[PDB]
């Protein structure tokens with residue numbers, strides 16, 4: 001069974017074996033989690049392009065980086081977005097399992113640039129739990145907002 005912790009910190013300072021980048025399909029660098037990952041592990045972006053709802057892994061700069069492309073909710077219906085967000089997290093979980101990754105730093109996919117201006121913390125978190133429950137990884141969830149930290153902690157606790 002996996003364990004779940006939440007850290008309010010820059011994901012680039014994570015102490016885990018692997019990190020999930022909240023990526024775009026083209027594998028370009030832009031504002032958010034993507035900028036911090038690009039600065040700390042710059043060569044992790046070579047050939048990282050991958051379709052929406054998929055993940056692509058690389059070892060570079062002494063780190064395992066998992067480029068997960070959540071949907072942009074401005075570009076899909078709510079139902080299509082929900083399906084694609086679930087897919088992105090399952091793709092991440094499959095990479096964790098197949099590669100025997102013991103611990104992973106994960107941000108909440110599609111909750112920033114890709115949120116279509118809605119609060120999607122719980123939508124994204126619940127897909128994170130569903131997908132990563134299929135692993136035995138130690139998952140550390142990273143956010144920047146104190147109010148999110150508390151909501152995520154409450155969500156973790158409720159599963160006990």
Ligand SMILES: Nc1ncnc2c1ncn2[C@@H]1O[C@H](COP(=O)(O)OP(=O)(O)OC[C@H]2O[C@H](O)[C@H](O)[C@@H]2O)[C@@H](O)[C@H]1O
Pocket residue numbers: 009010011012022023024028029030031032033034036070107108109110111112113114115142143144145
């Ligand atoms: N350094 C960080 N550490 C931890 N959490 C962070 C960091 N930066 C942002 N967050 C939080 O992590 C969450 C994810 O926000 P986002 O990074 O927008 O991911 P998306 O999937 O919504 O959009 C990805 C696009 O954004 C980029 O342009 C990429 O190039 C893509 O184009 C938010 O709640 C943030 O508060």
